[PDB]
């Protein structure tokens, strides 16, 4: 046969388009100021990052050890306005836009840009309109249980940081794209993954679904988890399939 | 009862000497044929004296601890009043509104204010007036 598109997406043509992007949205390096007290920065820019549905915040901080101003690229939370003050550290106030250790926050609080590990600089709840809920704490071998946007429960060390509030950008998926052009423009600044051609519309050399006098898969689209590349197409390791009406 | 009276220390917010600390010589609310509005005659410091340490020589300390003043008529809207005030031991009535028409009169008044300001800075009872405003 022939190498399928999924196998061909290893890079090259299918790399991300990052020319117009303004920088990675990592929170900050976990330093002495954030570990023992707080540090006050002033947000000065709120900009649109192409390929990202949430605005980015350019925030200026004073370097504790050198005569220099450091600019960060915070993921802007909703309600953030230019010229305001954000506080990052253990002793920071529980205010929207402030960065605090997860273990120092009350249970049930709404946060964003949460770290999976200490010093990770933000891993969870970074997309627009998404957030993480602090479910509970456990002091003995300090660990905090949190609820992820997917609904999963994750245990993180009680020293990881998070931004109080919800990521800005609202509910972006509530508006229909309404046009192939809108979809083209959306994915142009992201990567070369659009448009997509169906496997059943292909030939047997191209896709496992290709061929036949009628456009049909022929075999089950649910493939085993340990499938070789080139045959791992369709519904990989599907626990269930079809329309579901009511479950947890 | 007046926020702006002679001897009060104010901050200049507009003009060449923006951010400079001045002392009001007379707060003339009314006006004569010329300047018939609420202006204030002030004396400020254009170049603040530089810091001096115990490790400097007497000549260098004398050179560094020098104040060059400016006398200017500034309207009320371009002033930021304070409450530190000034003694105004000598600059009471020697300088008048007529001291702005002659360049020689302006130079003489500036020299007198310079002498008073340097004498006040030496054994400074008002350090806030002579320290620069950092903005």
């Amino acid at each position: 046969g022939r190498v399928i598109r999924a196998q061909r997406k290893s890079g090259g043509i299918f790399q991300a388009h990052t020319r117009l992007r303004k920088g990675a949205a990592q929170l900050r390096t976990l330093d002495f100021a954030e570990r023992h007290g707080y540090i006050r920065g002033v947000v000065q820019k709120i900009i649109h990052d192409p390929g990202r549905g949430a605005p980015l915040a350019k925030v200026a901080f004073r370097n504790p050890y050198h005569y220099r101003t450091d600019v960060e690229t915070f993921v802007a939370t909703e309600g953030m306005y230019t010229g305001q003050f954000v506080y990052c550290g253990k002793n920071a106030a529980l205010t929207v836009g402030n960065v605090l250790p997860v273990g120092e926050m009350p249970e049930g609080t709404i946060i964003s840009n949460v770290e999976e590990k200490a010093g990770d600089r933000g891993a969870l709840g970074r997309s627009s309109g998404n957030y993480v809920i602090i479910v509970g704490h456990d002091v003995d071998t300090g660990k905090t249980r949190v609820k992820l946007p997917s609904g999963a429960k994750k245990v993180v060390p009680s020293s990881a940081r998070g931004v109080v509030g919800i990521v800005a950008g609202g509910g972006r998926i509530d508006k229909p794209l309404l046009k192939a052009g809108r979809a083209f423009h959306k994915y142009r600044v992201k990567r070369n993954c659009w448009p997509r051609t169906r496997g059943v519309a292909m030939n047997p050399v191209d896709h496992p679904h290709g061929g036949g006098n009628h456009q049909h898969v022929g075999h089950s689209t649910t493939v085993p988890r340990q499938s070789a590349p080139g045959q791992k197409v369709g519904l990989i390791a599907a626990r269930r399939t079809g329309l579901l009406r009511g479950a947890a | 009862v007046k926020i702006l009276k002679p001897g009060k220390v104010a901050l200049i917010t507009r003009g060449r000497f923006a951010g400079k600390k001045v002392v009001i010589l007379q707060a003339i609310d009314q006006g004569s044929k010329s300047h018939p509005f609420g202006h204030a005659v002030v004396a400020g410091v254009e170049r603040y004296p530089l810091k001096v340490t115990k490790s400097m020589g007497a000549k260098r300390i004398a050179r560094r601890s020098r104040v060059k003043p400016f006398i200017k008529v500034v309207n009320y809207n371009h002033l930021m009043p304070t409450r530190y005030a000034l003694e105004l031991d000598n600059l009471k009535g020697l300088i008048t509104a007529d001291t702005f028409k002659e360049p020689t009169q302006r130079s003489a008044a500036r020299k007198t204010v310079k002498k008073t300001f340097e004498e006040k800075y030496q054994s400074g009872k008002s350090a806030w007036f002579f320290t620069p405003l950092r903005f």
């Binding site: 002495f32 100021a33 023992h36 007290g37 707080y38 540090i39 006050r40 004073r62 370097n63 504790p64 050890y65 050198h66 005569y67 550290g89 | 001096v52 340490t53 115990k54 300390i61 601890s65 800075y121 030496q122 054994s123 400074g124 350090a127």
Partner: peptide, 29 residues
């Protein structure tokens, strides 16, 4: 004499730039 005024530095967190102290323990040798 009156012009020699003490100007101390707090050196607290987020107050003033830290002084150049010994960093030999954290040096990447």
């Amino acid at each position: 004499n009156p012009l020699f005024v003490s100007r101390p530095r707090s050196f607290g967190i987020g107050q003033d730039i830290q002084p150049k102290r010994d960093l030999s323990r954290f040096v990447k040798w």
